[PDB]
Every structure is written in structure tokens, then in C-alpha cells.
Write a protein that binds this ligand. Structure first.
Ligand SMILES: *[C@@H]1O[C@H](CO)[C@@H](O[C@@H]2O[C@H](CO)[C@@H](O[C@@H]3O[C@H](CO)[C@@H](O)[C@H](O[C@H]4O[C@H](CO)[C@@H](O)[C@H](O)[C@@H]4O[C@@H]4O[C@H](CO)[C@@H](O)[C@H](O)[C@H]4NC(C)=O)[C@@H]3O)[C@H](O)[C@H]2NC(C)=O)[C@H](O)[C@H]1NC(C)=O
Ligand SMILES: *[C@@H]1O[C@H](CO)[C@@H](O[C@@H]2O[C@H](CO)[C@@H](O[C@@H]3O[C@H](CO)[C@@H](O)[C@H](O[C@H]4O[C@H](CO)[C@@H](O)[C@H](O)[C@@H]4O)[C@@H]3O)[C@H](O)[C@H]2NC(C)=O)[C@H](O)[C@H]1NC(C)=O
Ligand SMILES: *[C@@H]1O[C@H](CO[C@@H]2O[C@@H](C)[C@@H](O)[C@@H](O)[C@@H]2O)[C@@H](O[C@@H]2O[C@H](CO)[C@@H](O[C@@H]3O[C@H](CO)[C@@H](O)[C@H](O)[C@@H]3O)[C@H](O)[C@H]2NC(C)=O)[C@H](O)[C@H]1NC(C)=O
Lengths: 439, 49
């Protein structure tokens, strides 16, 4: 049998569905999402890491003039300084006191640490949604795992499942993302080959093992100090390190809808957005005929306690007279109250206890125990606790529905107003008829 | 659950209060003041003899 249903995306909240196949006993299916994963398709844009400045030894040409040639190194800078008179530990390097020159050359390379410490700049594409679902099938807990795209049906215990597509395509990852080790950041990284000094992306490479390194670190060689052989330079510090110190909070802590973020691969887990269409092909063997299944009559309901505490704070007792021993499926005929149990045992004339959760100030519902609807209603009390660590097990408030059954004040006041309106309208009609009659 | 009540100061007469917590069976507490002692704090003025 094909049953189609829609369940909210909230993870950890079981949901009850009626499989109502005419001629067969009604069935109640409990389905609960254990994990919903959005894994976007990532295309590696590039890699950022820490650079190292390679500076060969300076060339001191004295009694002469030095010169250098342009090279094709990533960020190569070369210069010649005149009038230098360097000293070594033993004294002056060489005799001629002037007209000496120093050749200073340096370049930027990606450090070996780029193999280990790096940030991967990715582009994000459509997300391959996947889901894990627990189903209470005929009293047995079954687990399914399927891609939520309206395809890839999974068959367990001869029951076939198709899941998705997502009712909302919202994903916490935007087009451009950055992954460092396990933290995913949303930033508009600079295009490859157009990095800026001192910021994220000053040094870039297509892959960690690639030898193509683009570097824009604003490397300017400076004049060495008098009497020294050092090679000074004014270079913007590593933008990767500055980003590391100034990362801020990743998506793991700032994602909307309570999404969790994992890496390797990059996954968005448990995003409570939208809802899920679920279609179940049910084997015919699972159904039981109406005449074969037990029938209950002369049944009543009483609620000893009701508290809209969001953890099944209400408990009801239903007295029943069962035709014979068997298994039936309790279901609530209204959305405002939800029943914890899906199936009760019945035998002769006895009573069964059910647990339910609601937001109503006065519970009024009709429980369909087994092809039989019993009206159950009673007062409910507010809980004393203010905050809990679990999501509300019942449904939303609903407009005007949760009006407590002491709103008879509203009915009485509106009845009095309608009474004065009706009396006044009767008076007006009488006088109008009299005046029309008079000529 | 915090229950607040008032009992007369008479000694030896038990009084009963109904702790009514919704969703639970009513409870009845009988409390009796066996001894109430007022001990003033004394500053000795002097000694006569
Ligand atoms: C037969 O039986 C009788 C009855 O018991 C006995 O009498 C008792 O004698 C005791 C010995 O003198 C009394 O005990 C104490 O004696 C102290 C002697 O120095 C005296 O100083 C005591 O008084 C201080 O302590 C009291 C208890 O703490 C306080 O209530 C009192 O106010 C005093 O406290 C001081 O108060 C001033 C106020 O200005 C403060 O400035 C001080 O800082 C306080 N100091 C302290 C330390 O608190 C106390 O009298 C005993 O009281 C007494 N019985 C009664 C009922 O009074 C006979 O002795 C016994 N026969 C024999 C042979 O022993
Ligand atoms: C330290 O631990 C971290 C994570 O725990 C780990 O980071 C990973 O580094 C590798 C590089 O060795 C990255 O690349 C992966 O390596 C496998 C090796 O089997 C390759 O198959 C892949 O590399 C390709 O992947 C790109 C995806 O498009 C290709 O386009 C490109 O050509 C790459 O060659 C695979 O991705 C890996 O991505 C990271 N992981 C993360 C989450 O960033 C690191 O390797 C560990 N070791 C060291 C020494 O740091
Ligand atoms: C089918 O599975 C549901 C829920 O799925 C469960 O999820 C985890 C909690 C793991 O236990 C999984 O193995 C399991 O599939 C079961 O319902 C849950 O059963 C547990 C039993 O341990 C209930 O815990 C109890 O809760 C009461 C009241 O709080 C405590 O006093 C107990 O000490 C115990 O902790 C849990 O409340 C219940 N959840 C519901 C009903 O929503 C179900 O029992 C299981 N059925 C079968 C036939 O396998």
C-alpha cells in the first residue's frame, strides 16, 4: 500500500501518521528523524597558507658595481645599493672605501607548513540531502537511510521508503566557504591571483602539492644599515596568520536553525527547516481486516491529570469492552494533542492508560482507539517549571483553539450584547413598520 | 514543591494542611508545636547582694 505523508524537519520529535486503508484495521505509524545531513558539492578554489621569505646571501661587490637580472620566482625583488662599507667580525670586508655596491635579492615561497597548516577556499553547489529515519513498524523499530531527493528508495522488511525532496532548499553554506581544520566560515575570499597583502589570500595555490604559487606580500627591499651585512626588507606579514588570530566564530556556532557543521566531508547536520515528504510502500501482509481485528464498544474516557508541560504531561484512562483479545492502534483525531503510545492491548472489559502532550488549557479531543472514537475532555494545569532541555513534544498553539473552557464568559457577554442588539433591532423594526403603515 | 501555611502558636494542638499539587494525589500534613521558646538576649546591668 502506498501512503504519502509530510513530517516537519525537527530532529528527535516522533510523528504519528494514520494509514487508513478501508476494509482493514486502521494503522498508526511512528516516524522520527535521527539525522538529516546536507552535504554540498565542493569545488576546491584554492589553498592559503603561511609563506616564507627566501633570502640568499647578499653580494658585496667592492671596487666595482654589482648588477642582477630579473627572475620568474613568485615575488622576486632585487636591488643594488651604492656606497656600502660592510664589516665582518675581523674588520672591514675589503679595502676600497667607496663606490662599493651590495646586491640584495629575495623572494616569497610557500612554506613546507602549507602541507599541514592551511585553509581551503571552496565554492559550494547544490546539496545532496540525506536522512536517517526510525519507524515503529508493527511494534518493531526499523532504521532506514536514504538520499532525500525523491529517489533512491530503500526497502527494509519488505517495506519500501522514498524520502524527500526537501520542502526548502535553504542551506547554511553560501556560495564561497573556507575550511581550516574543522571550522567552516562564510567569507567572500579574493579571486585566485588577485590576493591582497596582509589579508586572507596573500599567498595562493591551486592545490597543496602544486608548485604554482601566487604571492602579493608587498615585498620591498630596504637599504642595509651602515657597517652591517644584513638584508632588511619591509614586508606585509602573513595574511593567513592574521586571519587565524582574527577568525571569529565559525558556522558551527552561528548557523541559523540550530544547524551543526562538520568537516571531512563538509556536512550540515540537523537543520530544522522545511519538512519532508515520505512515501511508504506497505506490504499487504501488515494489514488486518476490520472484521478480524477487535472491535471495542461501551467505552469511556477520564483524565485524572493534565499538564501542558511538553513532555506528555497528560494521562488518560479509557474503559473499554473488547470483542476479543487482539492488538489495536490508538490515534488522536485532533492536532492539538499527541499520544505517546501507538498500540495498546485489548481484552474483554477492562481499562487502558494512555499518555499525551498538548498546549491546550482545557483538553478536548476524540481518541480513535480502534475504528471507534471516544470523546475525552478535562481541565489542564500549567507546569511550575519555566525552562526544559527538550523540544516541545506537542504541536503549536493554534489560533483561538487553546481558549480554555472557561471562555463561557465570552459566550455569555457576547450573548448579552446580542440580546440588547436583538431587542433594539426588534424595536426599530416595529417602529419602522408602524411609521410605514401610517400615512 | 514549596507549601506555605500558617499555624496558631498554641502548643500541643495539631493542625492539618492540604498540600494539593495538580497531577498528584492530595497529601495531608499534621504539624504540632511541641515547644516554643523565646530566649531574650541579656546585658547584665549589675549584681546586688
Ligand atoms: C550555686 O548556684 C548559683 C546558680 O547557678 C551560682 O551562681 C552562678 O555563679 C557563676 C559564677 O560567678 C555565674 O557565672 C558567671 O560568673 C562570671 C564571673 O566573672 C560572670 O562574669 C558571668 O557573667 C557574664 O557571663 C554571662 C553568661 O555569658 C552573661 O550573661 C553576663 O552578662 C556576663 O557577660 C558579660 O556581660 C557584659 C555586659 O556588660 C559584657 O560586657 C561582657 O562582655 C560579657 N562577658 C561574657 C564572657 O559574656 C556569669 O555570671 C552564674 O551566672 C551564676 N548563676 C546565675 C544564675 O547567674 C553559684 O555560684 C553557685 N555556688 C557556688 C559556690 O559556685
Ligand atoms: C592532517 O589532518 C588533516 C585533517 O584531519 C588533513 O587535511 C587533509 O589534507 C589532504 C592533503 O593531504 C587534503 O586532500 C585530501 O588528500 C587525499 C589523499 O588521499 C586526496 O585524495 C585529496 O586531495 C585532493 O582533493 C581535492 C578535492 O577536490 C583535489 O581537488 C586536489 O587535487 C587534492 O589533491 C583529499 O582532498 C584534504 O582535503 C584535507 N582535509 C581537509 C578536511 O581539509 C591532513 O592531510 C593531515 N595531514 C597533515 C600532514 O597535515
Ligand atoms: C523503539 O524505539 C523507541 C525510541 O528509540 C530509542 O531511541 C534511543 C533512546 C535508544 O534507546 C534506541 O535504542 C531506541 O530505539 C523506544 O522508545 C523509548 O524507549 C526507551 C526505553 O529505554 C524509553 O526510555 C525510558 O524512559 C522512561 C521514562 O523517561 C525511563 O523511566 C526509563 O528508565 C527509560 O529511560 C524512552 O522514553 C522511549 N521513548 C519514547 C517512548 O518516546 C521504544 O521503546 C522502542 N521499542 C522497541 C520495541 O524497540
Amino acid at each position: 500500500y502506498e501512503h504519502v505523508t509530510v513530517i516537519p524537519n525537527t530532529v528527535g520529535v516522533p510523528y504519528k501518521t494514520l494509514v487508513n486503508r478501508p476494509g482493514y484495521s486502521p494503522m498508526v505509524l511512528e516516524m522520527e528523524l535521527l539525522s538529516v545531513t546536507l552535504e554540498p558539492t565542493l569545488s576546491l578554489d584554492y589553498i592559503t597558507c603561511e609563506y616564507k621569505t627566501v633570502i640568499p646571501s647578499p653580494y658585496v661587490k667592492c671596487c666595482g658595481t654589482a648588477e642582477c637580472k630579473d627572475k620568474n620566482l613568485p615575488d622576486y625583488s632585487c636591488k643594488v645599493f651604492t656606497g656600502v662599507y660592510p664589516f665582518m667580525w675581523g674588520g672591514a670586508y675589503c679595502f676600497c672605501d667607496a663606490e662599493n655596491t651590495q646586491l640584495s635579492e629575495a623572494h616569497v615561497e610557500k612554506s613546507e607548513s602549507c602541507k599541514t597548516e592551511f585553509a581551503s577556499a571552496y565554492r559550494a553547489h547544490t546539496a545532496s540531502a540525506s536522512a536517517k529515519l526510525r519507524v515503529l513498524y508493527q511494534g518493531n523499530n526499523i532504521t532506514v537511510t536514504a538520499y532525500a531527493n525523491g529517489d533512491h528508495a530503500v526497502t527494509v522488511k519488505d517495506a519500501k521508503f522514498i524520502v524527500g525532496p526537501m520542502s526548502s532548499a535553504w542551506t547554511p553554506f553560501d556560495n564561497k566557504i573556507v575550511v581550516y581544520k574543522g571550522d567552516v566560515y562564510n567569507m567572500d575570499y579574493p579571486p585566485f591571483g588577485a590576493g591582497r597583502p596582509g589579508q586572507f589570500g596573500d599567498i595562493q595555490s591551486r592545490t597543496p602539492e602544486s608548485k604554482d604559487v601566487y604571492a602579493n606580500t608587498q615585498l620591498v627591499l630596504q637599504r642595509p644599515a651602515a657597517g652591517t651585512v644584513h638584508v632588511p626588507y619591509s614586508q606585509a606579514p602573513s595574511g593567513f596568520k592574521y586571519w587565524l588570530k582574527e577568525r571569529g566564530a565559525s558556522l558551527q556556532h552561528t548557523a541559523p536553525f540550530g544547524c551543526q557543521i562538520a568537516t571531512n566531508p563538509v556536512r550540515a547536520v540537523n537543520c530544522a527547516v522545511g519538512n519532508m515528504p515520505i512515501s511508504i510502500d506497505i506490504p499487504e501482509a501488515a494489514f488486518t481486516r476490520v472484521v478480524d481485528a477487535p472491535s471495542l464498544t461501551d467505552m469511556s474516557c477520564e483524565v485524572p491529570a493534565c499538564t501542558h508541560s511538553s513532555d506528555f504531561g497528560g494521562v488518560a484512562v479509557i474503559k473499554y469492552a473488547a470483542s476479543k483479545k487482539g492488538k489495536c492502534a490508538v490515534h488522536s483525531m485532533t492536532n492539538a494533542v499527541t499520544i505517546r503510545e501507538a498500540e495498546i492491548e485489548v481484552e474483554g472489559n477492562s481499562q487502558l492508560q494512555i499518555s499525551f502532550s498538548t498546549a491546550l488549557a482545557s483538553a478536548e479531543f476524540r481518541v480513535q482507539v480502534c475504528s471507534t472514537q471516544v470523546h475525552c475532555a478535562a481541565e489542564c494545569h500549567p507546569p511550575k517549571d519555566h525552562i526544559v532541555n527538550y523540544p516541545a513534544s506537542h504541536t503549536t498553539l493554534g489560533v483561538q483553539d487553546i481558549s480554555a473552557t472557561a471562555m463561557s464568559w465570552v459566550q455569555k457577554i457576547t450573548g448579552g450584547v446580542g440580546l440588547v442588539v436583538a431587542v433594539a433591532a426588534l424595536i426599530l423594526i416595529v417602529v419602522l413598520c408602524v411609521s410605514f403603515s401610517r400615512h
